[PDB]
Structure 1
Amino acid sequence: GEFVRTKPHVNVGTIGHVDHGKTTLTAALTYVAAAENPNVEVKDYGDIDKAPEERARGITINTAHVEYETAKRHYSHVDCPGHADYIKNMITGAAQMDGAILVVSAADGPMPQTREHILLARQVGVPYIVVFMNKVDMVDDPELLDLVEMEVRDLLNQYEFPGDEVPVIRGSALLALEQMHRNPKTRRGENEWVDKIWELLDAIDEYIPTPVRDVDKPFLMPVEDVFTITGRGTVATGRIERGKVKVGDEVEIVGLAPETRKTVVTGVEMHRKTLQEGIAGDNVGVLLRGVSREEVERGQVLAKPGSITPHTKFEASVYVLKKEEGGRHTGFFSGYRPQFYFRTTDVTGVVQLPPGVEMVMPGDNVTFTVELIKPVALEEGLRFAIREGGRTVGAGVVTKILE
């Protein structure tokens, strides 16, 4: 049908180590919210981990976007993979979040991708974190629980989140989900596990603010995914960063190709509901005329024509991770060619150290020059992550555009 705005819109999502319960929690949130609001459609576990490859490998691979609502706000929720080999997909998900739910298993405590996701969430601009300590149904010992919370709070402090202040809600995504399957009309106050999901929803409502967005600036939407809808055409999805888009608007597809391409927007939807106008903050699908899914891709941005010129060369200030943060064991030299992650963009780049700087070591705060192999929408002050060989090695911020 159509999309009617009634309340503020906020983008959230789930991050955390593999198997800690992100997808089960995402499902539980839809069920719990649906009992109290008839406009929420429930999403079961298999509705989220829906792809054949996810069923095959037994993990989340692709991000999933689900919708739910509280009395206060409307949410789009991006559920990210925790597996170490799908960090690239997690980064693109986090690039869409106004706040993240960090899921940590009470039975395991923080693990390497608990650290890595916190670190990366920061580098794609996630401003607030709420913690859900999951699987408490498995942990009687209340000292182990206090310890996990302590460790998580301290870990957040390491990446400049306010660790001693974040809400930490203790619950079981699975038992709440079970209760909602047995009674889909279960209301707040009836069930112990469901009420913990309400505690989480309250914390999301109140701790994660609605961000200041600018709908007056030129339209800009980083592309998070692209697909073909049968009988309609190519859809590029993403969170609108600023400005507005209406059907009939000409937009430019910027980045990753040798040259920029223009086309006309022929549809805008949020959660498969028709939008008269997409605005900053909306999580939308934009139907694009006359382009195939091989002509638009993740990491490009849609923009008002002429408003963004992509770049290839820049200066940056970089912190190189110590190995005690899952970084490199050894340093690197000029000519090092890692992957650079800017918002939803992932691109190989060449490190060109200045004359006199022979080597960069883990733990170093350093400045250098990067030449990307493809043009990308870039901006001064833009944060990025650096990865190489399947591990995060650095965190940086663009100092100055050179080209």
Structure 2
Amino acid sequence: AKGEFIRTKPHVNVGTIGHVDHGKTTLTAALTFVTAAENPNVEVKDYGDIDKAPEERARGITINTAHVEYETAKRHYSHVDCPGHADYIKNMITGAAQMDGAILVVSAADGPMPQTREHILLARQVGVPYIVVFMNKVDMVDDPELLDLVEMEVRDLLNQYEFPGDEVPVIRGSALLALEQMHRNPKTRRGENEWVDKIWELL
């Protein structure tokens, strides 16, 4: 009652970094629910069990790199979910020392923060060729052209440590909402619900 792994598509490890409280984990649980419906072989994880360690849970934050499995009819992924803060950097650095690609995560409301830097810096010294940004917390105050300033300065940061910043695919949206509807929408593909389609732009 464990089942044999059926290697169909190719496997690639992608991790998720970025400062604290910026949606790193939820965005992670999201990719689980999102990519779920449109294909089996995923096994759903939630904001709760993604961070099953007491305190990590009861206390609020993420303390240990997760490790999630979700695919696409295109490519199979293994998602290593790093923690924000400092202190635990010794656990993100270990999560990072793996992941082929890093799904960077910045927040519209806050913008690139102190850890956002170092993480990127570690990625340039860990050996994570390729980064993808994902502005989260966008569903905040109508910023006609403010969230645009983020993608202007975040790219400045990436192209500040030898990263294709100007090329880096900066998706936009919210993970909470995206998650939320999915949370109460198990089965349901893309090209339908608002935000859910914002996750796929990233996937």
Q: CA deviation at 1:99?
A: 0.4
* CA distances 1:339-385 after superposition (whole Å, capped 9, x unpaired): xxxxxxxxxxxxxxxxxxxxxxxxxxxxxxxxxxxxxxxxxxxxxxx
Deviation at 1:139, TM superposition (A): 3.6
Size of the alignment, in residue pairs? 201
Secondary structure (helix, strand or coil) at the match of 2:95 reads helix
Question: C-alpha offsets along residues 268-292 of structure 1, whole Å, 9 cap, x if unaligned?
Answer: xxxxxxxxxxxxxxxxxxxxxxxxx
- The aligned residue for residue 366 of structure 1 is none
Structure 1 residue aligned with 2:28, among 26, 29, 49? 26
Once the two structures are TM-superposed, the CA of residue 185 in structure 1 deviates from its matched residue by 1.3
Q: How many Å separate the matches in 2 of 1:184 and 1:56?
A: 26
Counterpart-to-counterpart distance in 1, 2:146 and 2:110: 10
- What is the rounded CA distance, in whole Å, between the counterparts of 1:138 and 1:27 in structure 2? 21
Shift of 1:82: 0.5
Q: Is the 8 A contact 1:15 1:22 kept in 2?
A: yes
CA distance in 1, matches of 2:157, 2:59: 29
Note the 1:295-306 alignment, pairs <5 A: none
Deviations 1:260-318 (A, max 9, x none): xxxxxxxxxxxxxxxxxxxxxxxxxxxxxxxxxxxxxxxxxxxxxxxxxxxxxxxxxxx
Assess if the C-alpha contact under 8 Å between 1:100 and 1:128 holds in 2: yes
CA distance in 2, matches of 1:197, 1:128: 19
Aligned counterparts of 2:134 and 2:202: Cα–Cα separation in 1: 7
TM-score by length of 1: 0.49
Residue 106 in 1 paired to residue 108 in 2?
yes
Query: Per-residue deviation at 1:195?
Result: 0.2
What is the deviation of 1:49? 1.2
> What SS does structure 2 have at the residue aligned with 1:56?
coil
Whether contact under 8 Å (1:59, 1:83) holds in the other structure is no
Measured in 2, the distance between the counterparts of 1:89 and 1:13 equals 12
Once residues 139 and 132 of structure 1 are traced to their aligned partners in structure 2, the CA distance between those partners, rounded to angstroms, is 18
Residues of 1 paired with 2:196 and 2:17: CA distance? 21
Partner of 2:74: 72
Q: Report the secondary structure of 2:133's partner residue.
A: strand
Whole-Å separation in 1 of the counterparts to 2:180 and 2:6 = 31
Which position in structure 2 is the counterpart of 1:393?
none
Question: How many angstroms does 1:53 deviate by?
Answer: 2.6
Q: Secondary structure of 1:13's partner?
A: strand
CA distance in 1, matches of 2:55, 2:31: 24
Deviation at 1:122, TM superposition (A): 1.6
- SS of equivalent residue, structure 1 residue 10: strand
Residue 85 of structure 1: SS of its match in structure 2? coil
2:140 is equivalent to residue 131 of structure 1:
no
* CA drift at 1:60: 0.5
1:222-248 deviations in Å (ceiling 9; x for gaps): xxxxxxxxxxxxxxxxxxxxxxxxxxx
What secondary structure, in the 3-state scheme, does the structure 2 residue paired with 1:24 have? helix
Secondary structure of the corresponding residue to residue 114 of structure 1? helix
Match for residue 99 of structure 2? Answer: 97
Name the counterpart of 1:175: 177
Structure 1 moving runs of 4+ over 2 Å: none
SS of the aligned residue for 1:200 comes to coil
Q: Give the whole-Å Cα distance in 2 for the aligned partners of 1:184 and 1:142.
A: 33
In the aligned structure 1, how far is the partner of 2:34 from the partner of 2:51?
19
Contact 1:139 1:145 in 2 (8 A): no
Question: Deviation at 1:187?
Answer: 1.0
Contact 1:82 1:113 in 2 (8 A): yes
| Root mean square deviation, CA, Å | 0.9
Structure of higher RCO (CA pairs closer than 8 Å, 6+ residues apart)? 2
Tell me, what secondary structure is at the counterpart of 1:26? helix
Distance in 2 separating the partners of 1:45 and 1:142: 30
Higher helix share: 2
CA distance in 1, matches of 2:98, 2:55: 24
SS at match of 2:104: strand
1:166 and 1:104 map into 2 onto residues whose CA distance is 13
Are positions 1:17 and 2:19 aligned together?
yes
Determine which structure has the larger strand proportion and give its number: 1
Return the alpha-carbon distance in structure 1 between the equivalents of residues 159 and 59 of structure 2: 34
Percent identity reads: 99
Equivalent residue number for residue 119 of structure 1: 121
Residues 122-176 of structure 1: CA distance to partner in whole angstroms, max 9, x if unpaired? 2111000010000111141132101011110000011110110000000100001
Match of 1:38 in 2: 40
1:67 is paired with a residue whose SS is strand
Q: Is the 8 A contact 1:14 1:102 kept in 2?
A: yes
Q: How far apart are residue 105 of structure 1 and its match?
A: 0.6
Shift of 1:192: 1.3
Superposition map of 1:202-221 within 5 A: none
- Residue 56 (structure 1) shift: 3.8
1:58 Cα deviation after fit: 1.4
Structure 1 residue 182 displacement after superposition: 1.4
Task: Report the alpha carbon displacement of residue 186 of structure 1 after superposing the two structures with TM.
Answer: 2.1
Tell me by how many angstroms 1:184 deviates: 1.2
Tell me what 1:60 maps to.
Answer: 62
CA contact (8 A) 1:106 1:139 kept: no
Report the structure number with the largest CA radius of gyration: 1
